[PDB]
């Protein structure tokens, strides 16, 4: 879904739309499910 985002750096920002580029998980991507039974 829309998981995969993290703070790209350690600088405080607020009330802003910021464009960045990094190693993020793509949205609505195919991830492998490993159960635990």
């Amino acid at each position: 879904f829309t998981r995969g985002v993290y703070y790209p750096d350690k600088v405080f920002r607020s009330s802003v739309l910021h464009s960045t580029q990094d190693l993020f998980l793509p949205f609505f991507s195919n991830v492998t499910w490993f159960h635990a039974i």
């Binding site: 995969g4 739309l17 464009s19 960045t20 580029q21 990094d22 993020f24 492998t32 499910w33 159960h35």
Partner: peptide, 28 residues
Amino acid sequence: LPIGINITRFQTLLAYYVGYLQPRTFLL
């Protein structure tokens, strides 16, 4: 961590989900 160590594979130690990161642009 200041490791200087090559990582090509990993193993999970005991449900979990594994995906891969890509160099993509995002508007946050």
